[PDB]
Ligand binder design. Structure first.
Ligand SMILES: *[C@@H]1O[C@H](CO)[C@@H](O[C@@H]2O[C@H](CO)[C@@H](O)[C@H](O)[C@H]2NC(C)=O)[C@H](O)[C@H]1NC(C)=O
Ligand SMILES: *[C@@H]1O[C@H](CO)[C@@H](O[C@@H]2O[C@H](CO)[C@@H](O)[C@H](O)[C@H]2NC(C)=O)[C@H](O)[C@H]1NC(C)=O
Ligand SMILES: *[C@@H]1O[C@H](CO)[C@@H](O)[C@H](O)[C@H]1NC(C)=O
Ligand SMILES: NCCCCCC(=O)O
Ligand SMILES: [Fe+3]
Ligand SMILES: [Zn+2]
Ligand SMILES: [Zn+2]
Lengths: 335, 6
């Protein structure tokens, strides 16, 4: 058999991948790149085999020929007798979150406010909110809608990166990897928690997972869910308990992609690797847990229960859904 | 309906 070469985005992912590789007896090995688009290019060149991707990045990968292999499955809201690997995925809820104390703010008064996004080109952080804003404003000038933002991946001198903070030294401002303080779900929620931004575009799970003591991290350890509100598209504000009736969209779960001729081997290796290091895996927590990273969602989201098999050997457009693909392609007309 | 970005 062949080794599977994973692609880690940035140095924190690379460290976790190197621990996985050592524990896997090198059944998995690691390549690393600075951004997710650069990892996609390593896999297209055949210099890496696979990585797990947000749906906006699956669109970029899929336009280049890479295919979905397995999907993240988090705990289901409804009981199921099916094994995690065979249980159907339920998308996650993209939401817009604000502070309750910011009393005037609704979906309809976001213009000229400060925003926090997971990264350009990601589903909840960017494609869903900016796609809705372009459409509602009738304007492609989404780079001028908010007064300042942190949108990792955007031009670092532009207003879309003005709120980004870089790393411990202030280097790498706005890079779309975990070195940027405000990257990703947890970084964009921290941008809101710290009142750097007025609004964060994340998913429902992020707000729950980083409030009320669910996270012990210093910036989160003291946050209370009741201090946050969701912005609904009808211009109302709701408690974060009401995400099923106050979301911007339902997103397809993050999933692993690879080149088509390595998909079967990547699939078999991952099913074995999660049997060892997955949630309740043979070797987790004693040796290594593939789906933990101290809340930092490195390689996989920390709320992943397993990687699940896909139904219907789907193409990337079947996996993302036609409606979402068309929304992305509509927004990408602006660029 | 476009192609690969890279
Ligand atoms: C919003 O996200 C949270 C966190 O994932 C979900 O709350 C979890 O729901 C699971 C499955 O029901 C429970 O067993 C977990 O205990 C809950 N976690 C926490 C921290 O409370 C919540 O269901 C999601 N809301 C919607 C509408 O999907
Ligand atoms: C932004 O608006 C565009 C244009 O209306 C939306 O695109 C349409 O989506 C519907 C439903 O999926 C399709 O039947 C149409 O064919 C699409 N129209 C065009 C011209 O492509 C798009 O969904 C909207 N974006 C968001 C994020 O809601
Ligand atoms: C490495 O992979 C081989 C072949 O599938 C298998 O026999 C071995 O158990 C694997 N070990 C680990 C630790 O993943
Ligand atoms: N256009 C369909 C987007 C995918 C929705 C997420 C889901 O149903 O799992
Ligand atoms: Fe996402
Ligand atoms: Zn809905
Ligand atoms: Zn099909």
């Amino acid at each position: 058999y062949t080794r599977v070469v994973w692609c880690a985005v940035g140095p924190e992912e690379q460290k976790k991948c190197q621990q996985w590789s050592q524990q896997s007896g090198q059944n998995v090995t690691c390549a690393t790149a600075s951004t997710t688009d650069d990892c996609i290019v390593l896999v297209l060149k055949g210099e890496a085999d696979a990585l797990n991707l947000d749906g906006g990045y699956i669109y970029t990968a899929g336009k280049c020929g890479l295919v979905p292999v397995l999907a993240e499955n988090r705990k289901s809201s409804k009981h199921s007798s099916l094994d995690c690997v065979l249980r159907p995925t339920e998308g996650y809820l993209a939401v817009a979150v604000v502070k309750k104390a910011n009393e005037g703010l609704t979906w309809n008064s976001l213009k000229d406010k400060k925003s926090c996004h997971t990264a350009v080109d990601r589903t909840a952080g960017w494609n869903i909110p900016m796609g809705l804003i372009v459409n509602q404003t009738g304007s492609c000038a989404f780079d001028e809608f908010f007064s300042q933002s942190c949108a990792p991946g955007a031009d670092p001198k532009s207003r879309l990166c003005a709120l980004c903070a870089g790393d411990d030294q202030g280097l790498d401002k706005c890079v779309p990897n975990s070195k940027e303080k405000y990257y990703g779900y947890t970084g964009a929620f921290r941008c809101l928690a710290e009142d750097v931004g007025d609004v964060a575009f994340v998913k429902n799970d992020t707000v729950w997972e980083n409030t009320n003591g669910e996270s012990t991290a210093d910036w989160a350890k003291n946050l209370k869910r009741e201090d946050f509100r969701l912005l609904c598209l009808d211009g109302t504000r709701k408690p974060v308990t009401e995400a099923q009736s106050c979301h911007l969209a339902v997103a397809p779960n993050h999933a692993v992609v690879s080149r088509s001729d390595r998909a079967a081997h990547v699939e078999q290796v991952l099913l074995h690797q999660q049997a060892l290091f997955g949630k309740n895996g043979k070797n987790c927590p004693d040796k290594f847990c593939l789906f933990k990273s101290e809340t930092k969602n490195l390689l996989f989201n920390d709320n992943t229960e397993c990687l699940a098999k896909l139904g219907g050997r789907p193409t990337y457009e079947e996996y993302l859904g036609t409606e979402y693909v068309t929304a992305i392609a509509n927004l990408k007309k602006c660029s | 309906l476009e192609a690969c970005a890279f």
